[PDB]
Symmetry: C5
Subunit: 213 residues, 5 copies
Amino acid sequence: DDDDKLHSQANLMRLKSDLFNRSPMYPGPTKDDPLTVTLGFTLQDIVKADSSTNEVDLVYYEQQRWKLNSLMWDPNEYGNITDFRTSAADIWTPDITAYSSTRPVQVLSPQIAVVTHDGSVMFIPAQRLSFMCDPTGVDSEEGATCAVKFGSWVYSGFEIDLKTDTDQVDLSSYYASSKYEILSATQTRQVQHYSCCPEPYIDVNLVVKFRER
Amino acid sequence: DDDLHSQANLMRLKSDLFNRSPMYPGPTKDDPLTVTLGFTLQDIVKADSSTNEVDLVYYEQQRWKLNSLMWDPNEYGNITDFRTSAADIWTPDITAYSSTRPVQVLSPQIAVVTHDGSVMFIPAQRLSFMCDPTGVDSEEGATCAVKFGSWVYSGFEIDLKTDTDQVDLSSYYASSKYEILSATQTRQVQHYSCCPEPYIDVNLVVKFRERR
Amino acid sequence: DDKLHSQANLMRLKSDLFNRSPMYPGPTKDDPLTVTLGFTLQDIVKADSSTNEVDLVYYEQQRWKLNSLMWDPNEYGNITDFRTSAADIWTPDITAYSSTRPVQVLSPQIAVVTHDGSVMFIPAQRLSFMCDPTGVDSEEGATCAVKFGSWVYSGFEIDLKTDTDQVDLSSYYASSKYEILSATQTRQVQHYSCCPEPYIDVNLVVKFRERR
Amino acid sequence: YKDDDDKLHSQANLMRLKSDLFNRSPMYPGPTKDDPLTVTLGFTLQDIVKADSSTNEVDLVYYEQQRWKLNSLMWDPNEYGNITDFRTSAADIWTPDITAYSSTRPVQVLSPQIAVVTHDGSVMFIPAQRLSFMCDPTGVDSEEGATCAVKFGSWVYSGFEIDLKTDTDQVDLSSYYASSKYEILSATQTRQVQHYSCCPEPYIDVNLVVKFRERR
Amino acid sequence: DDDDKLHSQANLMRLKSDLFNRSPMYPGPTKDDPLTVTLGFTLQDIVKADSSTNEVDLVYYEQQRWKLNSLMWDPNEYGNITDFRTSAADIWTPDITAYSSTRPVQVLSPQIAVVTHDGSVMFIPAQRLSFMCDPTGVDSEEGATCAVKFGSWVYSGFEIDLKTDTDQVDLSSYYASSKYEILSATQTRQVQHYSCCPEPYIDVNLVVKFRERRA
Ligand SMILES: CC1=C([C@@H]2C[C@H](C)C(=O)O2)CC[C@]23CCCN=C2CC/C=C(\C)[C@@H]2O[C@@H](CC[C@H](O)/C(C)=C/[C@@H]13)C[C@H]2C
Ligand SMILES: CC1=C([C@@H]2C[C@H](C)C(=O)O2)CC[C@]23CCCN=C2CC/C=C(\C)[C@@H]2O[C@@H](CC[C@H](O)/C(C)=C/[C@@H]13)C[C@H]2C
Ligand SMILES: CC1=C([C@@H]2C[C@H](C)C(=O)O2)CC[C@]23CCCN=C2CC/C=C(\C)[C@@H]2O[C@@H](CC[C@H](O)/C(C)=C/[C@@H]13)C[C@H]2C
Ligand SMILES: CC1=C([C@@H]2C[C@H](C)C(=O)O2)CC[C@]23CCCN=C2CC/C=C(\C)[C@@H]2O[C@@H](CC[C@H](O)/C(C)=C/[C@@H]13)C[C@H]2C
Ligand SMILES: CC1=C([C@@H]2C[C@H](C)C(=O)O2)CC[C@]23CCCN=C2CC/C=C(\C)[C@@H]2O[C@@H](CC[C@H](O)/C(C)=C/[C@@H]13)C[C@H]2C
């Protein structure tokens, strides 16, 4: 019967209620309860390289994945619901930031995440980013090389650790008719040491080598 | 008192729907939703050959049906139909896949709800998307394409469809810098490595050239 | 100390109207609302022939009248009108049909409600819209038009009219880059193959040229 | 231990005062013909950033001083441990709807939107703004320069509800940017009255007239 | 077995809850309760120098630091937690403003502060700022000199004592491939009085000498 649809809605509603409007929520990672965030970029386009200001504009998808015990559930208690979509405001998200942007990142996609019964969150914002990049050599065979680091703004490696599944930037969705073609693009986790601080900070360094098509 | 009874019936209905009964948490695998999508292309504003971006203005017609929004007009003084702010209901997360700037909304964010639980939502939008306008200065013109789909829902939660593969050009701006040779909107089913579920988009293909 | 009671009188009035009473949920077929619309054209700021976009600054006068906003001044210390945030009341969704960028509001979003139930709301706006400015550098000038109308209501709900078909030019900026040769605002009735209901818009037609 | 004991008492008093003003008393409904308000307006001109002769728009940067007084914001400092004034977000109080009448773009606020309220009920509010307004800069490349003007007034209130006032007709140029592309020859702010056919009430504005030339 | 982690989260929720729900929140600095705010700059890039409007665009990190008794806790009472991060909207923050910006500041970093057990708040927004600056001489060896002041918009020196750790601007992460190189950058505390009024107003003057790069 079509009543099974009404039972599906009630089960989701109760699940969300149990995880948000009842269970003690998430204050962010701690030194004793650290969090690993998996990061990966899908480079869609180099829109603009500005040699009068040394800014380059990228469009990319930033894939983020982390896992919380306070988001786990048994699907058997909720009509075998295995995953659900929720607004990215309802849950805690990591403060992953580009370290050398020259204006605020523009969000191209709806700020919605996917939560899975094991406590997995997948969040993949499409973004347009202006960052510090000298495009000298872009009109040559060798091309120009630029880099931008992404990491937490406020957490050290003892609270947020970063990892990549791979060192290769996903280029399978690169705009085939861009003004610029990619010679190579890598994403490398770096354990970074600052003079201020005994504890290391983790970033992912995005190195893009490119030239005019 | 004729007016006052029709206003009270509307406020009662909106209450029953939006102060009860109880909520709507989006589509699921067991409770999937059909969103029908259609485009009315008004203008190609700008084709920047220095960055390969093209700016479109269009209306995006979205229609879907929720049982939680159904009512019997007989219970509410023959109200078959009402207007509501789009912030007050669930709407689908239909997104352009290759935009270069956040989409800019041109129209009031208001939807119409019919007693059959059907929702009609038609935002007007300006979109910048990835498009190489090479050839636009010629008789063959340039061809550009952009896909629209849910960002987060798969084909098992939202079934995207169209009523036609023909973009509505009946209000394309007659004095645009660009004339439309053709504009089509096509449903495609796509799979990604990570994931068993299908993902559905509508591909909008526009062929265009500079107006004489 | 009437100054103290003057405040409590207005406080009580706003309470009685916004609380106490059944809410006004907008117009319906059962209860159509006449909305009067008129433009005061202040400046043609910019005419872009690369994109066929023209930028206007104008005041958009909106006027309508409601039973649920009427009161007797004697009951409220001789108060005959009050100011209120436009966010606190229903306002009409009058939209440019061919803008190219979201309209930018230049004035505080505040309306004036009078005891006879009439609302005055006059947003100052900057609008980019579809206009071919060819011939602006000549004596005959260029001619462009843009239609304003409700996005979601038909003529059965919003009975849209103008008080005059002449655009107010009494404060068009005397040192503008462009001079106005004429500006008219004309109500039109249109029909669509979806809908039995008539649809109404106001067509702002501006003829203009480079000042010399 | 009268260290952070005085400090605790002073913090508690401040929070007691704000609570007594913004919770124990009904929300201020704005001025009326029987309870009218006088807003005192003065400008501090900081910079003429740009003069665009292809659109006839000029961009100004200035501080707009606004001051007014309300009985509902008065208090006795003795009942609140000698507190004479406090700072508050502009959003937590009523502020007048003073608007430029010939802007071509929405004003951009450069400063934090915070006001200062004094025990006599007076409020000081000084937002820094960038403004694009209608201005023909022909003459800017001359000795007498170019002259432009922009009126400021309430958008929805007549002079019977919000009266507008200046302390002086001289614009404050003591903070004008000395390396600006444009130098100021004069800047005045003059109160004006008129009537409209709609209404019997006087309508008031302050006309900011600026005379300027290219600095060389 | 090991869910002393449960727990670790419980301790932090309890702490934030104790500081934000069970104790009176700070109402801001006052005459009788003045605050010391320490301000410091890390210059990242001079993006753009516009000679037709006399505007220059800077990207910098603005270090802000202050200390409240009401944000102190005993780490022993909360499972040894010595610090936590929290949205900047949750706490009071200083209204430090550039005095000569020509566009509203743009924040580039998430608005999150770090609070330590002694009542310390560290808050470091990355910002892009357009300000008033005549870049004449930027194409020469001497370079051009520009300056911009930062201070409280609404508080006098009787409520906020503005301070620096040092007069040298941090250049250790200045973008090496910038269009402009830095010759010098100083941050100086200034006390000003206005004929208007008896209270002093404190600011930090950022003075940057810079020129076009020749790399
Ligand atoms: C210098 C610095 C960089 C530099 C900038 C350049 C593009 C780069 O690659 O690393 C990236 C952002 C980062 C390094 C990564 C962590 N965050 C910042 C700036 C924000 C710092 C905050 C909020 C507080 O100071 C942090 C340590 C202070 C440290 O000296 C500091 C300011 C580091 C910051 C920890 C935290 C308590
Ligand atoms: C690669 C990709 C595209 C590409 C871009 C190009 C224009 C195209 O045609 O498809 C459009 C958006 C989409 C495909 C359509 C659905 N969403 C995305 C990106 C957002 C993805 C989110 C939130 C989650 O990851 C998805 C994994 C699928 C896949 O690897 C992935 C990131 C697909 C995304 C499932 C979903 C739970
Ligand atoms: C085609 C159309 C135009 C055109 C564009 C051109 C400048 C013109 O003159 O009219 C302007 C906006 C309008 C004109 C009529 C009112 N609204 C629209 C688009 C928005 C429509 C919505 C939200 C729903 O469809 C409406 C009827 C559908 C109709 O075919 C339709 C799409 C009309 C729209 C009613 C309402 C339930
Ligand atoms: C004509 C006009 C101007 C003109 C524009 C030019 C730069 C000037 O100096 O005055 C600036 C804004 C103002 C002048 C006075 C303040 N209001 C406006 C526009 C907004 C008006 C509203 C909301 C209602 O009409 C007002 C009076 C009607 C009057 O004819 C009217 C529309 C005046 C408006 C009062 C109020 C009830
Ligand atoms: C004149 C002035 C400047 C100028 C600009 C130039 C770069 C400079 O060094 O000082 C920068 C901002 C400041 C100086 C420091 C305090 N803030 C302002 C402007 C905002 C002032 C407000 C909100 C109220 O008046 C303040 C004191 C009045 C004082 O005369 C005044 C208007 C000072 C303001 C305190 C407060 C109650």
